[PDB]
């Protein structure tokens, strides 16, 4: 590895091969932060053998994220985690393809009916819950609050429901199936990322066979077919499944797949988002006010939906600090990179091409004024309007926010996300009280381990008290 013309600064770190493995996996944005230092916007490093051009500038994102698999891919990548975490492996088809698919079950009348069937699994999940449970106030961990709540909304939403006359006792085995699914589900993703990298214990492994095993059968084809009102996300999915000749039990394997990705965010997102408004009374004041004014003029008022700018501005804000995916590609021939400001850069089919927006545009304080601190209204104006002009380096900002990913491998639930996140939010502030047991803690540190899957995790759990409002 010697630097060839017109290709990146090249940094092989101190150990053989493994080079900056382990202060990577320790704590990515640390790491890429000190780098960025070192050698500015654009750097090629190794890890764990692996050389990896790091792209910093957000102003250059575009010249890469919209590249062709031919050039650049990220479906080697993808279907190595679908294998080794998830243990799927499916016939080879097109992402291109299946994503567009998908993303059509998941947008115009077919999101109506799902934003319309959250509301109703959040509403009937969360007061289920809470009557069950009785009037007075009820401890719990704020994640383990938000996350439960989300996901078992969620899966009831794409995954379907005990009954579709819709009863009080099919309502109830909704309840206690979906807090099943949540609670062995979590066991999972807690060890995603030692999955990933291959470091679980013998004990680590005979629990996530175990939990794995579990879970195949909860969302096995079998189970699900006796399910009411399923989604066209998911009925449309186990068509293509079922056009590939995957077996049932290959199928269930990529629906557990499936949960995760498309559960696997929204719980952590809100959790944040409601711990920040929690820690800032002026923030909350604001979402509030403004949903009471709404409410004030079981379906939900299309205004907290399409009209409520200053929750906009909340949940990118909240985004902006706590969402860090990788944006990676395989780099298949040897390709020339244009930045924007002149320079071109030279990459080397075989390398590993990493974006991480988290670092840059995300927490970059010539970008955002201290970016560091949740400021709840960071994307609004003075008159309370959607902010959207961005600055670096003497230019306009395209992708100043990016938790959703970019290019072809971006988020193709985020509409759904957004409007179940919302609705959430909505049910916690205007029928419960929602309380910090300590009014003084502190905003817990991430799971380091954890940068790249998505929304980050914290390290532990912030102890809340909720009930429905009294009065
Ligand atoms: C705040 C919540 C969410 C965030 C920040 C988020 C973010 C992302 C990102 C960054 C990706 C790119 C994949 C990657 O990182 O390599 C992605 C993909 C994807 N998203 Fe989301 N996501 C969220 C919630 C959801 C929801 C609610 C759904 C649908 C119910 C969803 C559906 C999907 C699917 C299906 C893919 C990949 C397609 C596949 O492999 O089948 N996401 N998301």
Known sequence: RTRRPGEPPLDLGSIPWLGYALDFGKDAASFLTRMKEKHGDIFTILVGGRYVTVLLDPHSYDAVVWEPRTRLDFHAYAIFLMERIFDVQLPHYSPSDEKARMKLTLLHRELQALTEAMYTNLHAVLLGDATEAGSGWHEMGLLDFSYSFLLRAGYLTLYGIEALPRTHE????????????????????????????????????????????????????????????????????????????????????????????????????????????????????????????????????????????????????????????????????????????????????????????????????????????????????????????????????????????AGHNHCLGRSYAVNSIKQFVFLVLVHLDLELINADVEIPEFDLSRYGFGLMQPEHDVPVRYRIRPH
């Not at 020339?336 to 995300?362: H, K």
């Open 170 to 405: 099919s309502q109830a085995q909704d309840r206690v199936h979906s807090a099943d699914v949540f609670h062995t589900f979590r066991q999972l993703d807690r060890l995603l990322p030692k999955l990933a990298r291959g470091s679980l214990s013998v004990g680590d492994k005979d629990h996530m066979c175990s939990v794995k095993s579990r879970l195949w059968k909860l969302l096995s084809p079998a189970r699900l077919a006796r399910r009411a009102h399923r989604s066209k996300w998911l009925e449309s999915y186990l068509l293509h499944l079922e056009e590939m000749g995957v077996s049932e039990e290959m199928q269930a394997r990529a629906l557990v797949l499936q949960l995760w990705a498309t559960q696997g965010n929204m719980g952590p997102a809100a959790f944040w988002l409601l711990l920040f408004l929690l820690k800032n009374p002026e923030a909350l004041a604001a979402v509030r006010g403004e949903l009471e004014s709404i409410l004030w003029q079981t379906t939900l008022p299309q205004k907290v939906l399409d009209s409520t700018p200053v929750l906009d501005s909340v949940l990118s804000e909240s985004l902006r600090l706590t969402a860090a995916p990788f944006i990676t590609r395989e780099v298949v021939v040897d390709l020339a990179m244009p930045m924007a400001d002149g320079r071109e850069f030279n990459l080397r089919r075989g390398d590993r091409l990493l974006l991480f927006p988290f670092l840059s545009p995300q927490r970059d304080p010539e970008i955002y004024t201290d970016p560091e601190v949740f400021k709840y209204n960071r994307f609004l104006n003075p008159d309370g309007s959607e902010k959207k002009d961005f600055y670096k380096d003497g230019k306009r900002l395209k992708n100043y926010n990016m938790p959703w990913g």
